[PDB]
Amino acid sequence: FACKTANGTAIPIGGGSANVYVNLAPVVNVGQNLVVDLSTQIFCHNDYPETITDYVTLQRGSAYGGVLSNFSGTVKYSGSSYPFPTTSETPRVVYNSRTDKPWPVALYLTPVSSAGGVAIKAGSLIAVLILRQTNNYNSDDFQFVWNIYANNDVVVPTGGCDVSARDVTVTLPDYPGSVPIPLTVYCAKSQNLGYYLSGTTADAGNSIFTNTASFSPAQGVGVQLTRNGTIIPANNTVSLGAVGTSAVSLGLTANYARTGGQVTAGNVQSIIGVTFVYQ
Amino acid sequence: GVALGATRVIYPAGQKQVQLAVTNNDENSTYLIQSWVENADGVKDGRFIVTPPLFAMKGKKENTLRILDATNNQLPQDRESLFWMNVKAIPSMDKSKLTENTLQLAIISRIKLYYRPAKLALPPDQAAEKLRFRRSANSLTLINPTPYYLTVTELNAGTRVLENALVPPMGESTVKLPSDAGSNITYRTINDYGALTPKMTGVME
Ligand SMILES: OC[C@H]1O[C@H](O)[C@@H](O)[C@@H](O)[C@@H]1O
């Protein structure tokens, strides 16, 4: 029983170890699968098929470098899947031919939301796979160790941030009242954010959002947003700085402002757009 | 909580279409996704079209936005052209707060979209380095001769930390030089993957 690498290298009868060099998808997104198919690069064969039956097993599977810190994954061995890094010696597959058959092993790796840019360095030890071979002939128990190196960087693009917002705020604090506006943002990967408001305005300072509502339009008012006392006029980019894993409150408050002159009873409703700009 | 799967998009000149991911976190609350692309000046020309132009995302879901090139190669072919991708999340009217004074917000994600003429020499990886300077006692002028938009971030007059800059292709930008200077100009940039390139040293031209 011996195995060889599609690249060239072999591990002879009795076991030993070899390097397996793999080119991986250059880009993988959070949520997706990075697939390292070794069945395309590692082959074995039985040396005496007619009288001996060989049993190949995935003894152990271990992760290194980026694979270890940026991914969660499974190992598909001969049709079935298991947790990778592995936790138990896999079931045994049989080899019965002098003809080089593949070793059906594939790594299915999915980047974590926290995965940087370069989740796997070019030239790094990505994994070590231990092939254990026995037989129905004697006490032969040999190990074929495969050291999997990545030939290139596998980048995981940075995603957009999440704008955690409760919902349709009831700016009910009757005409003079003002409420705080719960709105925070967090990013799986720290990055600079900025935002600006947008919508129909009712003033020359362009910062009092027009009253939009049917039920007897409480005329003369309008909604104005403030951030810790500072007024936010439409299309004025407010720089949030670096936003990371800890949510950042924009510190918004809805305020009533007067547009025209005579204020009048009725409802006051409004829709404002908040646009987060990514660097 | 609706989020885009990228903080930017590279549109390869020629591609029939590029796609972007959108995912809605809020386990319960539908949204109307309305997307569009404005040009550098902020005007909605039809250079690029997104589909579906309007659709719903109910609860935790994931869908794909596809950006279509409408610009019949009527853009400069020696450099990238700057555009802005916008994805708006439209909530729904509560028939519950109907006779109440209410305020509704519509979150929008706006990211850069570069039209990259697929036929340029200098490979993107090899662009940040080409960044030279010109530092006075108040007017440091980032200078980019390549054909890519340089998103200069973490800039420093050696010790002093400055304000980020976006340096246009074969163009330049001047960031207010504080004078708490040095010349040990330092900066990193943001690559096609919205990833920080490695810190490099300012090299005044
Ligand atoms: O291939 C069959 C047989 O070949 C050699 O004798 C050794 O590698 C054995 O361990 C193996 O069982």
From Swiss-Prot, chain A:
What would you give as a GO molecular function for this chain, any one?
D-mannose binding
Q: Which GO terms describe its biological process?
A: cell adhesion; cell adhesion involved in single-species biofilm formation; cell-substrate adhesion; mechanosensory behavior
Superkingdom assignment: Bacteria
What coarse category fits the chief subcellular location reported for this protein?
A: other
Record's keyword terms, sorted: Fimbrium, Signal
| Gene Ontology CC entries for this record | host cell membrane; pilus; pilus tip
Pfam families registered for this protein in UniProt: Fimbrial, FimH_man-bind
Q: Which cystines does this chain contain? A: none
Q: Which residues cross the membrane?
A: none
Please name the CDD domains in this protein's record.
FimH_man-bind
Q: Which Gene3D superfamilies match?
A: Fimbrial-type adhesion domain (2.60.40.1090)
User: What is the annotated localization of this protein?
Assistant: Fimbrium
Membership in a protein family: Belongs to the fimbrial protein family.
Q: Which PANTHER family match?
A: FIMBRIAL SUBUNIT ELFA-RELATED, TYPE 1 FIMBRIN D-MANNOSE SPECIFIC ADHESIN
- What does this protein's UniProt record list under function? Involved in regulation of length and mediation of adhesion of type 1 fimbriae (but not necessary for the production of fimbriae). Adhesin responsible for the binding to D-mannose. It is laterally positioned at intervals in the structure of the type 1 fimbriae. In order to integrate FimH in the fimbriae FimF and FimG are needed.
Q: Protein name, please?
A: Type 1 fimbrin D-mannose specific adhesin
Native organism: Escherichia coli (strain K12)
From Swiss-Prot, chain B:
Q: Which UniProt keywords apply?
A: Chaperone, Fimbrium biogenesis, Immunoglobulin domain, Periplasm, Signal
Q: What is the effect of changing T174A?
A: In strain: Clinical isolate 149 and O2:K1:H+ / MT78
Q: Does the keyword DNA-binding apply?
A: no
Quote the PROSITE patterns the UniProt record gives: PILI_CHAPERONE
Q: Name one GO molecular function term.
A: protein folding chaperone
Which InterPro entries does the record match to this protein? Ig-like_fold (IPR013783), PapD-like_sf (IPR008962), Periplasmic_pilus_chap (IPR050643), Pili_assmbl_chap_C_dom_sf (IPR036316), Pili_assmbl_chaperone_bac (IPR001829), Pili_assmbl_chaperone_C (IPR016148), Pili_assmbl_chaperone_CS (IPR018046), Pili_assmbl_chaperone_N (IPR016147)
Q: Which family does it belong to?
A: Belongs to the periplasmic pilus chaperone family.
Name of protein: Chaperone protein FimC
What is the originating organism of this protein? Answer: Escherichia coli (strain K12)
The organism's lineage is: Bacteria, Pseudomonadati, Pseudomonadota, Gammaproteobacteria, Enterobacterales
As recorded in Swiss-Prot or TrEMBL, the protein's gene is named fimC
